[PDB]
Design a protein around this ligand. Structure first.
Ligand SMILES: Nc1ncnc2c1ncn2[C@@H]1O[C@H](COP(=O)(O)OP(=O)(O)OP(=O)(O)O)[C@@H](O)[C@H]1O
Ligand SMILES: [Mg+2]
Lengths: 11, 906, 384, 51
């Protein structure tokens, strides 16, 4: 799991 | 699952879900006993690893949380990570998940804070060993997956990413943070970043983009290049490597201000020069806006190949694409030195080969003559321009031109523009010069002036290579002390060369617009042309244009319209880069008049572009301030104030305009909405500001290349029948022209209604008539864009004289300017080694589906159509090359670019 | 991954829209100009207080009409003559004054729950190339349904009247239902969608009135695509025998001919019909010149089944275990809903593991279950 | 109405080739298409039987 997958959910 | 002690491997896995008997008790007990037992712990390190590997199957936080809770202490309590220095350091492998089991898989704020900090130091010191790297690696490629490590690994990458980000926000840098406690410096953590990047590129794409951005330098990317140019074939194929690289640069346009943005693009250019596809290389060379980069790729195909091969023909093609003709100049002359075949090669780089191909297209389309035939009074004036507007592009109407009756019955400035429209029948052609000469040797000086307008317009399709260059004819007419003659001359020069810098051209345009003590209102054109030459490429910021604007403003205020054009000419000059425009903004602001404040805000738009989100709000504060000063009161100057008001409205739209193209294709939808409410905010405020806002809106759509092209001009047209200024209709049809007779049928009907139904003045009628014939040319002869057609986020040069003309209320003099319609996009075609005039097949799509690109890439399914199509505008711009089964394979990639295709058979 | 920046770009513009709009309202909206202020003085003179909705029965051409109110008294109303005298027609809802009734104004739109059924409330986010494959049978719905609306340009060139209608049919699970929703997403033309099983009611005569409504909305909205989902559900479906039954089925069919083209000469409606029983349809509907080219769907072949399975596995997590290429091989001329069900069930087998890797083993177990709906819902099993 | 759809389906074969005109040939293919569909269905000359 990439470090961005966590942050696409918030945007 | 339950406790059924230590026998087979199965029951050990179930034992350690509750409590290890082989990790937590043992390592702690052992460590606080002997330190000769460090050899024995080392053997159990591998044992500990396996139990984690087995328990990634399980998806519950609890069976790691409680189990390893006392092992998390042992790290600093007994091990201390320095009791026998190498031996505990190398044993921090199982201990790194243990800390994280309390960080990520348990949510308690006191500990979410405390252990972030412990985790950051031990990542940095154990990535020196590079054994932290291998721990990471076996978890990314896992044996089994679950929720926990999928959130925990993001924590590992963020400790590193975090420190680097904090050094830009704060000057505290390295281990003086209290949220990491660990530096990024040295080759302690720097060596950790490089190693991580290598592994994470290979299997995913993780920390690779964050490293580039947060370092913010050309250096970070130059480290990326090393790895990726290696990986270009065996790891992953060429094509995929391109998709990583271009994804980075397009994506970070709102994220890098001018000097950081160009610095990243240096490296993209460089990777492409290294890799197979030198077509990708050339395109980034334009993007930077360097002459220098264009040459090297041009030498790169041409020089090492000894024979003419497809390779020289390809070289000339790559340079031709820019209709700005920045590339066109550079690419010629290298061919003369080499000496293969001069005659085909040089034409191919310049815009002469594009003359030849339009003829084949034209034969299919035909020519339609349905233009007005009204005689005498003002009705003659309206009609004589309209015939030219129906036949824009290269067309045939010889017999009508020879019909000099209606030409001669125009009077005033009408004579100048009447002959000018005749020239736009042969827009982008060599031939037609003979018809122009006729008028040039007879009757009043006024028609002679109009002949020059036609020469300039025709010269867009033939100038580069210094083959029949426009300068040659038009220089005698510049010198001529007569204002009518001179103004027409330099307007034709400015169009013809667009961004092409050439020395003879540059220096003709300097002594003019440097004597603006003289009151000449048609000496706006003096600066217009000079501004253009800069556009497309890195700005000189010529001290001549800046100088003559300041002198002019001091000298006269009676000609406010003239100084208003000039205020825009400066902002239009500075296009071609946004780095240099930062210095000249302050130079313009140094001088201070209320009149000088007007000039400042137009140029602030050009400077702050491609991160301009501050700029938009800034031009809204600007709007408040007139009323702000006035409120206090409520509780020579006339010209200066009126300039102040109009520049501000023009600037608001202009800022948005630059921004929406450069910053991806996605923002274009939203900025359409901003303009509509913008007209609304001025409307039923101040009356004067409303009039200016109507005209800007139409060219705002035309500049940005808005997606929907059916709906908007037509909705706007009905609303604007009631409101003043029919000149708005002129600006709506610049957007509507699109693929002709898709939208454009409704334009003729609609605009025909507002005009035919109600008349109030013959002046208002004249504007409404002209707009209606401009939109179409028969059966999508051409399309219009401002996009370069090499970059789709690009902006043109030749269309900026259209962008000027919405600023001011209507004049017969404005009619002279508007005939120009250049910036044409070529009909896509496959040119062989002799040059074939027809394509084969192509794919068309309306729009992209890609959410991992946003500049637009055609998908690979499409709907297929035949040859001899002009490249459809917005609503059809995706083009894919079709021909692969027949062994026709493109050399020249096309992505809804203008580009001329070239193919190699096998 | 790494589309974050595209998400933030999009987001930033949303923030800028919110801002400009709020600030504009607040003392720069339309509060301080006389072409609003003095016009509304005399707008409110002849307006209420109550604005008493009427129903427009008939117009009289002298600036009057006979309205019947919802409150039951008639009025022979005047018409002020600034609202445009003849721009209002029977079935419009009218604003009558609190005193002596004049048509103060006219409301365009009055939301009925009966056009809610047709109208969309959701966006069909799967569009072109999520139904990927059947790229030869999508040139008979995007060269005659989508494309004339997008480009009337190509059809000005040939002249004559543009394509009219299509009928889709073939075996279940060829994407028939979604194709229609995917061309109407992209054009953004007025998407009415009506199910085949709501035309049949257990009430009579109001069935054809419902169907009559659907096309009046289409003709009222110039770019129009009407998806009639399921019109095999008109000859296999019936309720009671006194208000469903044969008589109802005949009536509805005939209503639909008048609507679709008949004598009406209405606005350009594209009709898209899903069916797989093509003798529930009139011999006045499956002649062409109303429905022009006819579309047959067959089960997608093996290389088309690679495309179908590739939509589904971009969403699936992948492993070094996974072998896609053998999942296609077992399937022989099978439907694209089997492939869609295998991957959804393969993710159900992953979930049971409580793991987030979907492997070849999860797909093949789900493949045998998906072929079990074809060998054991057949109780003969192997053909007797 | 069959013949009314010869022209439009001939206009679709014109558009794949990219024409502004139709010729004889594309009317041959168009006619062949409509005829096969008539067999595939019922009502080819039918009155809906009887007199
Ligand atoms: N080419 C395809 N690619 C992707 N998914 C497909 C494709 N064909 C069908 N499917 C899937 O199969 C399922 C059923 O197809 P759909 O509902 O679109 O219409 P149908 O052919 O009338 O079948 P039914 O109504 O019996 O389900 C849907 O979930 C759809 O996404
Ligand atoms: Mg369905």
């Amino acid at each position: 799991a990439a470090p961005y997958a966590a942050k696409l959910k918030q945007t | 699952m339950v406790d059924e002690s230590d026998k087979k491997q199965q029951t050990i896995d179930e034992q350690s879900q509750i409590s290890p008997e082989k990790q937590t008790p043992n390592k702690k007990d052992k460590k606080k006993e002997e330190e000769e037992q460090l050899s024995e712990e080392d053997a159990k390190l591998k044992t500990d690893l396996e139990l984690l590997v087995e328990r990634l199957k399980e998806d519950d936080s609890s069976l790691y949380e409680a189990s390893l809770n006392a092992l998390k202490e042992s790290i600093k309590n007994s091990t201390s990570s320095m009791t026998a220095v190498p031996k505990p350091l190398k044993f921090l492998r199982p201990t790194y998940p243990d800390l994280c089991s309390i960080y990520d898989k348990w949510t308690d704020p006191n500990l979410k804070s405390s252990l972030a900090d412990v985790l950051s130091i031990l990542a940095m010191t154990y990535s020196e060993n590079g054994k932290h790297d291998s721990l990471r690696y076996r978890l990314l490629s896992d044996v089994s997956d679950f929720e926990g490590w999928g959130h925990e690994y993001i924590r590992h990458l963020a400790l590193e990413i975090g420190e680097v980000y904090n050094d830009q926000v704060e000057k505290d840098a390295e281990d003086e943070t209290s949220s990491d406690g660990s530096k990024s410096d040295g080759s302690a953590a720097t060596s950790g970043f490089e190693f991580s990047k290598e592994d994470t590129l290979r299997l995913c794409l993780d920390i690779v983009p964050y490293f580039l951005k947060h370092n913010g330098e050309e250096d970070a990317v130059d480290l990326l290049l090393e790895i990726e140019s290696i990986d270009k074939l065996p790891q992953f194929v060429d094509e995929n490597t391109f998709q990583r690289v271009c994804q980075y640069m397009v994506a970070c346009v709102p994220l890098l201000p001018p000097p950081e943005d160009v610095a990243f693009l240096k490296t993209a250019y460089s990777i492409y020069l290294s890799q197979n596809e030198l077509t990708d290389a050339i395109a980034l060379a334009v993007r930077l806006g360097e002459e220098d980069m264009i040459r090297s790729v041009f030498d790169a195909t041409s020089d090492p190949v000894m024979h003419k091969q497809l390779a020289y023909i390809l070289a000339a093609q790559k340079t031709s694409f820019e209709y700005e003709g920045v590339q066109d100049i550079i690419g010629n002359g290298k061919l003369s030195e080499h000496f293969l075949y001069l005659a085909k090669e040089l034409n191919l780089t310049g815009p002469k080969v594009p003359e030849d191909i339009y003829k084949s297209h034209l034969d299919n389309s035909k020519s339609v003559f349905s233009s007005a035939g009204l005689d005498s009074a003002q009705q003659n004036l309206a009609s004589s321009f309209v015939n030219g507007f129906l036949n824009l592009g290269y067309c045939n109407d010889k017999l009508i031109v020879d019909n000099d009756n209606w030409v001669y019955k125009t009077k005033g400035d009408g004579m100048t523009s009447a002959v000018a429209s005749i020239g736009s029948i042969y827009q982008w052609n060599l031939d037609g010069l003979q018809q122009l000469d006729k008028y040039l040797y007879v009757d009043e000086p006024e028609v002679k002036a109009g002949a020059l307008l036609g020469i300039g317009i025709s010269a867009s399709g033939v100038h580069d290579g210094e083959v029949e260059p426009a300068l040659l004819l038009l220089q005698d007419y510049v010198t001529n002390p007569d204002t009518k003659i001179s103004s027409a001359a330099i307007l034709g020069l400015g169009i013809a060369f667009a961004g092409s810098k050439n020395d003879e051209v540059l220096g003709l345009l300097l002594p003019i617009a440097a004597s603006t003590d003289l009151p000449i209102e048609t000496a706006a054109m003096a600066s217009l042309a000079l501004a253009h030459v800069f556009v497309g490429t890195c700005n000189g910021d010529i001290t001549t244009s800046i100088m003559d604007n300041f002198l002019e403003r001091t000298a006269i205020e009676l000609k406010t319209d003239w100084v208003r054009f000039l205020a825009l000419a400066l902002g239009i000059l500075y296009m071609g880069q946004g780095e240099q425009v930062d210095d000249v903004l302050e130079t313009i602001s140094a001088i201070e008049h209320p009149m000088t404040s007007a000039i400042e805000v137009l140029v602030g738009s050009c400077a702050y572009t491609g991160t301009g989100d501050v700029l938009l709000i800034q031009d809204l504060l600007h709007r408040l301030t007139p009323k702000n000063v006035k409120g206090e009161e409520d509780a020579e100057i006339k010209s200066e104030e009126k300039k102040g008001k109009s520049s501000d409205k023009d600037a608001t739209t202009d800022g948005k305009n630059d921004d929406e193209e450069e910053e991806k294709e996605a923002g274009i939808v939203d900025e359409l909405a901003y303009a509509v409410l913008g007209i609304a905010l001025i409307a039923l405020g101040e009356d004067i500001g409303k009039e200016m806002s109507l005209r800007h809106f139409g060219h705002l759509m035309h500049y940005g290349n808005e997606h929907i092209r059916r709906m908007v001009p037509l909705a706007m047209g009905i609303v604007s029948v009631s409101d003043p200024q029919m000149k708005v209709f002129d600006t709506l049809t610049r957007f509507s022209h699109d693929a002709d007779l898709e939208v454009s049928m409704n334009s003729i009907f609609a605009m025909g209604l507002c005009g035919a139904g109600t008349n109030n003045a013959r002046l208002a009628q004249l504007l409404r008539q002209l707009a209606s014939y401009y939109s179409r040319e028969q059966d999508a002869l051409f399309i219009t864009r401002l996009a370069q057609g090499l970059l789709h986020l690009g902006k043109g040069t030749m269309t900026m004289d259209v962008f000027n003309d919405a600023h001011v209320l209507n004049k017969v003099t404005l009619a002279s300017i508007l005939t120009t319609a250049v910036g044409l996009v070529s009909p896509s075609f496959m040119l062989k080694h002799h040059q074939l005039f027809y394509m084969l097949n192509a794919g068309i799509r309306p729009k992209f589906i890609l959410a991992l690109n946003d500049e637009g890439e055609p998908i690979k399914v499409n709907v297929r159509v035949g040859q001899a199509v002009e490249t459809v505008g917005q609503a059809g711009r995706p083009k894919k090359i079709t021909g692969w089964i027949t062994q026709s394979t493109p050399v020249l990639l096309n992505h809804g670019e203008r580009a001329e295709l070239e193919t190699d058979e096998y | 991954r790494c589309k974050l920046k595209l998400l933030r770009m999009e987001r930033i513009k949303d923030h800028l829209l919110l801002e400009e709009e709020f600030v504009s309202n607040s003392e720069i909206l339309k509060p301080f100009e006389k072409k609003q202020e003095e016009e509304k003085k005399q707008l409110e003179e002849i307006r209420g207080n109550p604005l008493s909705i009427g129903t427009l029965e008939e117009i009289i051409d002298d600036d009057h009409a006979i309205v019947t109110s919802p409150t039951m008294p008639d009025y022979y109303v005047s018409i002020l003559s600034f609202v445009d005298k003849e721009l209002l027609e029977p079935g419009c809802s009218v604003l009558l004054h609190h005193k002596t009734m004049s048509i103060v104004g006219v409301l365009q739109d009055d939301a009925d729950p009966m056009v809610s059924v047709m109208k969309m409330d959701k966006s069909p986010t799967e569009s072109y190339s999520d139904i990927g494959g059947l790229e030869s049978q999508i040139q008979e719905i995007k060269e005659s349904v989508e494309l004339p609306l997008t480009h009337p340009e190509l059809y000005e060139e040939m002249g004559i009247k543009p394509p009219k209608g299509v009928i889709l049919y073939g075996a279940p699970g060829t994407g028939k239902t979604l194709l229609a929703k995917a061309v109407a997403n992209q054009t953004s033309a007025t998407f009415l969608r009506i199910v085949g099983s709501e035309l049949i009611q257990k009430y009579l005569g109001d069935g054809p009135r419902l169907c009559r409504q659907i096309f009046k909305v289409a003709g009222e909205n110039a770019p129009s695509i009407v998806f009639i989902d399921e019109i095999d559900a008109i000859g296999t479906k019936r309720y009671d025998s006194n208000s469903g039954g044969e008589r109802e089925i005949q009536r509805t069919m005939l209503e639909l001919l008048n609507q679709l083209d008949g004598f009406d000469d209405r606005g350009d409606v594209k009709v898209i019909m899903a069916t797989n029983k093509i003798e529930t349809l009139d011999p006045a509907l499956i002649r062409p010149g109303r429905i022009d080219r006819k579309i047959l769907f067959e089960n997608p072949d093996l290389s088309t089944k690679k495309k179908i399975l590739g939509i589904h596995t971009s969403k699936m997590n992948l492993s070094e275990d996974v072998n896609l290429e053998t999942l296609v091989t077992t399937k022989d001329d099978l439907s694209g809903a089997d492939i869609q069900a295998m991957c959804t069930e393969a993710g159900l087998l992953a979930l049971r593991e409580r793991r987030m890797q979907v492997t070849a083993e999860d797909f093949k177990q789900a493949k045998e279950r998906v072929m079990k709906n074809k060998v054991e819902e057949n109780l003969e099993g192997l053909y007797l | 109405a069959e013949l009314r759809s010869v022209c439009t389906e001939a206009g679709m074969f014109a558009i794949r080739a990219r024409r502004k005109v139709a010729t004889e040939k594309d009317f041959l293919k168009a006619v062949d298409k409509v005829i096969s569909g008539y067999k595939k269905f019922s009502s080819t000359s039918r009155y809906m039987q009887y007199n």
